[PDB]
């Protein structure tokens, strides 16, 4: 097949265009670039610049004030590489300036993620139990990471969708790759577009109409540092689904009875990514 | 002790022979070869030949048609090495020929697995809650893997039993090993016998009368490619057991109250293997 | 900040001394050495000597008699390095001498662990749901390991507290390290003191007033063998907490409703340690 990662305009999708091409991409690939969704490069770099300044020039005291007592990377700063995490509430901000910039940036990513999920649901004829808007008013997590100078083994996402913005390596190396058509397909930076991965919850809610592709990080050198902004659109704990339907599209569930929740399936802590089994 | 992996005839066991030797093997070793159980080499190789042909000569389109939208290795094809998985239903078959051959092959493995589990239960005097036949009418999973030219760290199985058929390395290298008597004991191919590992559910249901041994894969070279057929006999989600009894034979359960289900213990997704703790 | 691991006298804490220093250590570091808590070096080495003799000179038969049928390291002997595990009951002892010595040793560690947890709770004004003494009458696990001649990647503990005694490397190498102030701070043997790590349950029960620090094992050579005694003070399955409060101090819970138990959060098997996410 064409092993090309396609691009869709969110605006065009919302106008009812390219519906067969979109459905085919969802089923056969489960990833695409998304343009016209409110996510500019100029904005990514104002958020990026202020967090890198913090990473670079924040003192340990300032960093501690925005570090959670458990190192879960749910909110605030994590040093390991460095991460900054946020969600809809319970956020930890270094300063008023930072807060304004990152609140806006989060909001725009949450709006885009809901909007593309709405289009995934609509294109596949899917009405989640409890309706679309209650499904999308959910439990998102944003993680921004700086990586200094394959590096990560393949995994699939357990989100509904995952939105990824990157900055490129100064030396032009492309670190992110996904399985497409059996192949390793590069996923380069695009100043004009966000990368969308469908996750296993898209597969589940749509009754198997959406693929959750595996992806990894390649290793390359001088100028290979990079950043990423990873936005997970994750369902509420009480998201409810059919157990027999789950079994029909590949989920190896150990669930008694006919319906179950997300919490029943995953447990009491969110799990964002998953590897293939070695057994 | 004798660090020898013993062999039992299923037919002989069913006639009530070797009962003390069987009980001792179960308690002290928890693994054995099993003959006279309906599983021929000729049959393994008809199933093997048709899946290898598929792996080798199936196009990407044919492979996609039998690939689940989530890469769980529960059903159909997985490319990583390559795997073909099946169970009692919701299977994905490349062709009528394949389907006939693999349905028969699965059935024979499920029958053998139930039959040897029945003998484990009988030899240990065990009546599962809800009775033997409801316990054995369960949630099996078969995985056939091709491996091209230790490779895997030790784990124990969480099945009732696991049945393993292999094809040998052309160069005679023996890749599978298990802990026996504190030793690393080779587990070579036997054209005439299937390898049986007892899993943690055998330990649990029998109140600690069956060992769940650790095993691994050794690395060796030219002619070290191999295949395996791994059949997990896994309980139903609602399999129920005593919590205090579980605690008595080594299970580090965090379960309130006096009884629990398999789902309570393991969660909402099957887990097939488990490593020892590093903490 | 001072990246020094502080030391507290349990006796002094119980007299109401150093309360602001203790609270600051708990919030900012979440680890300390503890003196005057009933844990002598002389006693560590009587328990150590008798288990090392067993490890060294116990035959396979003797070892098998105190090995659980599942290799969970919950109770008795595990060979991998070698481990000896115990708890309040269901223990497996090689001999009357061993049993007397290790029962006393366990008891003293459980008493110290409860006592320092009581002081953590008191210093932070915390009344667990169901009260202090029911919270501390819990599910401890002791693991003693021998290691022959970083070796382990960073993790945090999921205990209330974890108490660690060590013996030193003959060559003086210091293998244990923790994150303090962003730094790698050595955690050497002290004949006079036990090392206390706060775990995530301390963070949870106190509403985020206690840090759960990450720690690891460094690799060095001749004379680098070592032992450790690791005592996990773990809550009961029915330990109950506020879900919104959990979310406020960093826990990425997927729990419906307003309250939850430890079992709801962690599942049906204890999990003792946890790594930071790579997603």
Curated annotation (Swiss-Prot), chains A, B, C:
Cofactor(s) it depends on: Fe cation; L-ascorbate
Keyword Iron: yes
InterPro entries xrefs: IPNS-like_FE2OG_OXY, IPNS-like_sf, Iron_ascorbate_oxido_reductase, Isopenicillin-N_synth_CS, Oxoglu/Fe-dep_dioxygenase_dom
A Pfam family it matches: 2OG-FeII_Oxy
Alphabetized SUPFAM superfamilies for the sequence: Clavaminate synthase-like (SSF51197)
Pathway in which the depicted protein is active: Antibiotic biosynthesis; cephalosporin C biosynthesis
PROSITE patterns: FE2OG_OXY, IPNS_2
Family label: Belongs to the iron/ascorbate-dependent oxidoreductase family.
Name of protein: Deacetoxycephalosporin C synthase
Gene this protein is translated from: cefE
